[PDB]
Write a protein that binds this ligand. Structure first.
Ligand code: O6E
Ligand code: O6E
Lengths: 862, 862
């Protein structure tokens, strides 16, 4: 096996010395070949104190007999002959305690080494939780500057033990490996087992004259070098790295629960032999642990969202109970589409179909019913990843517009559909497509010699239907049957995997106008142990949910008062009110749930009682809303100011609109009419900025552009108009030099947003240009040198000024370098991002003592 | 006694009839004289089914069998003779059941009764917590409009059982009772015991001639009337109410926990006889229960505020440990004055005195030091509310500047003092001072006839010294004495020499060196951890003292180990204290959840030499208070930065519009061109003024400063018209100014932008709700002859006009503040309401037949 070969390896990488001391007599029994030429007699049986100085021996011996030596590493020792600084790393092996010596090429202890990554941890913790891509990208970015390798990657393991690169930052000029998939056999289980114990592997150069550990034959024990930091990599990996042209590597390890699972590895490559000091490697261990800490939060947050999707679906399902059976679930605002994520829905009732979105034709839906009625008659529901895989003869007749389906037969020949469109199943492989039946074998020596990308075309399929999604469809099926259980799941392989669902209806209990209980759901009975008959007429507040001598017991008197308040506030507002409910069951179980209480309305429209139900949220979920509940009104109390300001700023903006519009009627000067056109564009800048409520609403998401005709002559004129008043006041000379043929180009990009981006960028030069200084604006389409045959475009704007350049603090705050942003540099961060959405990036460069804003943009048009 | 007299009372108020039925045979065992004339034959042995209609009798019979009959009260019944409505109040007594009937003079059950207080409940929960005065003030307001009594009071019970009025709202033209104290003799302990059972007690007529309840059953059981709502008030209290001139009363008992203590009472008075229907009385019971819960919450917040002060004192004390010298404890702003709430503090150290704040003279302080040197040798501390009470021979010389003092014996001659100034101890009694030697006497027949306020002057003392404040300064004993068994003498209230043992508040402290080994382990830490300092010194704090496995103190998991390392390294970089959570397992198994404060330790040479970690032990409720504070702060800094970007990026296009207007001027413009330009001018200043005064923190709750600028009336109408002309011209409504040519040409001086801003949104609110037809007319008037123009003032009247039904009042009343719903149309009017109101004017809607009109009158000068 591979593990047996790795643990029996007797070769070490020629960048250090490995001396092993006996556990009992505390003298060397094994040594590396290069020890004599690097530590200076090196013969076996000489105490280490002979080969070092007095402070080194005392420091080593004190930690030699320590309990756990992991934290004391690294240890700075000096040789007796020349006192050349060495780093000593000590790990204990049952055969002999092994010390690895690493020269200190021109931080002692675990805590001091962790300080090297302190700047990286403060960047990971100060991150918006929720997005795993941002967490992965910021971790690879930190390692890139922390270790200084040519290419840093985040290799994430999937369920099939194969991996995919989720993020990558490299030096410019290197081919990107982002998105590539690699076989599971590339990293065997021997390496996966050791990565949970070593957690850091470093290779200085894949072509090195390996040294030999010449342990004496008199040693009864089988000394192991698996845990050492100097272990020579296997010959297959040396050729594997040579094929990828990665001479040096530093592979990290991420373990979710330090149950425990190797989430992935952080791979740092280098085309040249690279050496990294041990404190940095130890620091990377801490950073990986912090990364694994935050990874476990993202999976928890994902688990919270899937719980909120169930809760939101439960809220929707209760609403569909009150609505009319055949047509109520369609006419209202929350449709059947909101129940299950879909691109369309249909409802075949009374030989009539109620299309609700991107659904097949009316004729085609009838043929869907014919296929369902015979091929899958036994099952009342069906879910298919792809309709062609199911066996539909005319799957291709309706095209690739829709390929998934989740249909349940409520009654007779009436069925309700749920259509899902296809997804881009394009996956790129690293040179070998992983397959389930491949297994690691020790006979293989040379790996694949080609690493070119493989484009594996996956058959046309939609997203797989989630397990919780299927119960939501089944829950509506129960609702519709009453208002008037085997499910087929053709997913993946062509196998009719029959399943039964779990009803997702919430525990529902109702009250009449006076207070007597009226309804008691079976889900309510199973949660509390009280049958429907025993709580069918007793008062809810007093006898059913009461403090003393009650069928269900509340915690204290506050619960009694709180329950009565909610049951009375329901009549005032029909909208559901969410409150925390807790009570004891007949068996003494303490349950914590979230109570939704809403009015019950009859056909006449009068209050006929209260319809309420509980949401069985988890303890972690309950605290999430409860904490947010303390600041829930902040979205209303504070929104008054934003709504008032936006409303109060809109009134005189309209006054500006009416005033200048009427000017066009009157007689105007020949060149004077041009002010109206410039003023109109600036006016539209106010209109669009008012629509954008917050910058925080665009940084995490994407601020959509505008597809409109647009000429470059006006925007530069409009952008200059904003900054002339500042420039004319504090003297600043401004000139524009742009292509005359570009005025008639009439580009298809956004005009108001690009004007805004250039407005503050041009303001930047004015605020830092000395009196009388210049300010040049340029433009260059360069349509003949970017491949305009394939529909694309290019753009560039230059902003040069005098004044020895702008200060560093304002300049550094762009590109998300410094976390804190000033009241002045935040706009530049938004402005820089606003051209990132335009496939461009702004840069700075100082030439001849001048400045330059190299802002680039691309016009994605067709 | 008083309780014995009440328990054997056979009189009831002539406001209803009382019928007592036996438990088994259900026959009338007792009745009142008024029953025959109110329920019609009637007598003992009469079945109650023969007094009402069949549907009503069965409803009563159903309630008689209910286990908890307080739920079904009240019950609406009708007499069979004439179907006269009645309310049945039922309560169970061991001897027999008692039924109270109440006439109905033009909600059945407890739930529907609570609906009458639903409006009052929502203005108690939606209250910003922190002060009991606001909660007490609003609760009195709820009962005032609900019950409609002449006056409503909040009577708080103090420790000595005497009461104090803490809140009061009355009908206009009364004598306020706020702040008045009343002796505990007024409310006997017998009445307090009954209030824990009968929450609400009502007296209708003070001079009513009670009708005796006849009971000639010759049975063993004695019929008690304590629980009946019809019970006759005691003879003494009947004369007690006559002196107060309060015929009717409605007292509500407030019990904090239902440990169970009567917090106080809510008293309602009415000069005329008053009747409150039972549902409102039951609703008042629910309101008291909600008030009781909120009172406990206010107490809990007050208790947490004390804990925060202890944590603040603990954090301050840790700084004094690192502070250099007894000279230094004065220099830095975290001085002794912040340690204890005091008006002054003086430190005596080696024949030199340092004073901070309001302290006595140099010479008097020396005698103060000499006074303890000859009076209180045994005690090392002192605490006197008043120095005159303590025994200073020259106490009067110090004056009112300093009256109280806390003293500390740092050394034989070293002393450090604190001073508190005299506080105005004004308490007004109701007419009889309450003395502790007063006991309830059952033989008393007439109460006091004088209720005028009697003012008792309390002796000149200071604020009462708290237990933790004397503890805080004792914690300074150990810190100062160590860096250089005991008794503390307290003089409080009556002259006494109480000796108490203080328990020092020094928090647990542990520190490490630059490598990781522990350097300190406080005795407080040893008690909490169970580990002696000997077993922790010279051992790694991370991994050997605090660690997951094989460690002295066991962390919960790898989460704590990583987090502890982060805070121990961020402290070196960040000198400021870091507030993080910390949990660890004591060797005894205790899971100590606490907060960790880490600050780097600086040597005298200025080089870092480790960390200084101390713990703030906080309850499970205090920790979440800071946790939600950060999350409340989590969206706080974001909106400031988000608004500062929207505000900054709207200013730039405004400068562009300003520049275009400044350049549209040209060489010269036509007669109308500059006029239409002028309308654009004042419209732009409205854009700038709104941005400068954004977020409306002042115009909504304060007196925003206005601008007095030479103004002309004619421009304000035209500029404000164009803002609303866009929507008006486009739709069916029209705008036509009323003839004011003489007065518009006439000049009045005011704030153009502020008046136009108010006028602009008032017209837009009009055009919006004009029902797609009719004309809008705006008029004006200048008043300088009708009002005195010799006062250098003038009156301006602006009158709008509608053509339609009229804006709804439930939205119009929102601008006056009566209504608060989610509709921005009323929000804008309310904010502008104070803006004109700031101009010594008012705004008034004036309804009419065809032409609904506004009225915007403001005070304008010249
Ligand atoms: C030999 C025929 C087979 C083999 C054996 C093998 N592989 C490892 C360890 C690693 N393999 C890795 C693969 C990658 N390297 C990359 O750069 C990328 C993607 C960009 C991948 C997927 C990685 C990483 C490791 C860990 C490196 C390390 O330091 O251990 C080993 C263990 C080496 C050792 O002696 O310790 C072995 C025996 N790998 C093959 O690809 C073929 C099938
Ligand atoms: C009789 C010699 C003594 C006495 C007896 C007494 N008092 C009560 C009940 C109350 N007395 C109250 C006093 C106040 N009333 C007020 O309006 C104010 C302040 C504004 C005060 C301090 C109050 C209140 C009550 C409770 C009234 C209720 O709800 O019942 C009683 C019990 C009456 C009964 O028959 O139940 C008795 C026996 N009070 C005196 O002042 C004299 C000394």
């Amino acid at each position: 096996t591979y593990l047996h070969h790795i643990q029996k390896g007797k070769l070490i990488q020629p960048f250090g010395c490995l001396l092993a001391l006996d556990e009992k007599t505390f003298k060397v029994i094994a040594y590396s070949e290069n020890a004599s030429e690097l530590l200076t007699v090196l013969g076996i049986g000489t105490d280490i104190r002979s080969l070092f100085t007095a402070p080194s021996a005392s420091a080593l011996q004190k930690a030699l007999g320590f309990g756990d030596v992991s934290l004391l590493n690294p240890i700075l020792v000096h040789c007796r002959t020349s006192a050349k600084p060495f780093y000593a790393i000590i790990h204990r092996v049952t055969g002999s305690i092994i010390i690895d010596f690493e020269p200190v090429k021109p931080a002692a202890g675990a805590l001091q080494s962790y300080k090297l990554a302190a700047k990286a941890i403060t960047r990971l913790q100060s991150l918006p939780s929720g997005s795993m891509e941002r967490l992965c990208d910021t971790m690879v970015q930190e390692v890139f500057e922390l270790t200084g390798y040519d290419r840093v990657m985040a290799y994430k393991f999937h369920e099939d033990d194969h991996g995919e690169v989720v993020s990558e930052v490299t030096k410019p000029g290197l081919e990107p490996y982002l998105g590539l998939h690699y076989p599971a056999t590339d990293i065997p289980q021997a390496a996966r087992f050791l990565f949970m114990k070593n957690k850091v592997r470093m290779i200085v150069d894949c072509n090195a004259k390996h040294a030999r550990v010449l342990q004496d034959e008199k040693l009864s024990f089988d000394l192991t070098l698996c845990g050492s930091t100097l272990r020579a990599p296997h010959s297959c990996h040396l050729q594997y790295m040579a094929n990828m042209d990665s001479i040096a590597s530093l592979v990290m390890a991420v373990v979710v629960n330090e149950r425990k699972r190797l989430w992935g590895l952080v791979v740092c490559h280098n085309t040249t032999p690279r050496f990294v000091p041990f404190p940095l490697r130890y620091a990377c261990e801490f950073l990986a642990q912090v990364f694994a800490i935050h990874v476990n939060k993202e999976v928890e947050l994902d688990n919270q969202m899937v719980e909120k999707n169930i809760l939101r679906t439960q809220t929707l399902l209760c609403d569909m109970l009150m609505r009319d059976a055949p047509l109520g679930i369609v006419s209202q605002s929350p449709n059947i589409m909101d129940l299950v994520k879909c691109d369309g829905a249909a409802l075949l009732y009374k030989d009539k179909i109620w299309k609700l979105g991107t659904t097949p034709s009316e004729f085609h839906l009838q043929e869907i019913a014919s296929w369902l009625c015979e091929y899958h008659m036994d099952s009342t529901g069906l879910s298919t990843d792809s309709l062609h895989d199911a066996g539909f003869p005319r799957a291709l007749s309706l095209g690739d517009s829709v390929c998934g389906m989740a249909a349940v037969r409520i009654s007779s020949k009436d069925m309700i559909f749920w259509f899902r469109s296809h997804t881009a199943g394009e996956v790129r492989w690293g040179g070998a497509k992983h397959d389930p039946d491949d297994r690691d074998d020790a006979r293989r020596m040379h790996p694949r010699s080609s690493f070119k990308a493989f484009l594996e075309v996956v058959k046309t399929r939609s997203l797989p239907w989630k397990d919780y999604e299927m119960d939501a469809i089944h829950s509506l099926q129960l609702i519709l049957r009453n208002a008037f259980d085997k499910f087929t799941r053709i997913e993946g392989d062509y196998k009719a995997i029959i399943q039964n669902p779990n009803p997702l209806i919430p525990p529902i209990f109702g009250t009449d106008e006076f207070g007597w209980c009226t309804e008691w759901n079976p889900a309510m009975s199973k949660l509390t142990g009280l049958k429907r008959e025993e709580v069918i007429d007793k008062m809810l507040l007093g006898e059913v949910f009461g403090t003393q001598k009650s069928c269900c017991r509340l915690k204290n008197q506050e619960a009694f008062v709180n329950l009565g308040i909610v049951l009375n506030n329901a009549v005032t507002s029909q909208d559901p009110e969410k409150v925390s409910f807790a009570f004891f069951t007949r068996g003494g179980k303490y349950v914590e749930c979230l109570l939704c209480v809403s009015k019950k309305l009859d056909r006449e429209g009068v209050v006929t009682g209260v319809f309420c139900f509980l949401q069985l949220a988890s303890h972690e979920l309950q605290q999430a809303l409860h904490v947010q509940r303390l600041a829930e009104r902040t979205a209303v109390k504070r929104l008054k100011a934003l709504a008032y300001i936006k409303r109060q700023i809109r009134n005189p903006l309209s006054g500006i609109m009416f005033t200048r519009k009427m000017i066009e009627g009157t007689e105007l000067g020949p060149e004077q009419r041009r002010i109206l056109q410039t003023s109109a564009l600036c006016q539209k800048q106010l209109s669009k900025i008012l629509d954008d409520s917050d910058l925080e609403s665009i940084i995490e998401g994407c601020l959509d552009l505008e597809m409109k005709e647009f000429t470059l002559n006006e925007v530069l004129t409009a952008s200059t108009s904003q900054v002339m008043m500042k420039s004319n006041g504090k003297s600043v000379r401004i000139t524009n030099e742009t292509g005359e043929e570009v005025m008639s180009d009439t580009l298809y990009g956004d005009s108001i947003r690009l004007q805004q981006v250039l407005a503050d960028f041009m303001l930047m030069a004015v605020n830092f240009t000395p009196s009388g200084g210049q300010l040049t604006v340029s433009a260059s389409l360069r349509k003949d040198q970017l491949g305009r045959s394939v529909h694309l475009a290019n753009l560039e704007i230059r902003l040069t000024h005098t004044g020895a350049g702008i200060p560093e603090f304002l300049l550094n705050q762009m590109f998300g370098t410094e976390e804190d942003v000033s009241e002045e540099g935040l706009s530049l961060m938004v402005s820089r991002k606003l051209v990132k959405l335009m496939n461009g990036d702004v840069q700075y460069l100082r030439q001849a003592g001048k400045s330059s804003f190299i802002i680039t943009a691309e016009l994605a048009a067709a």
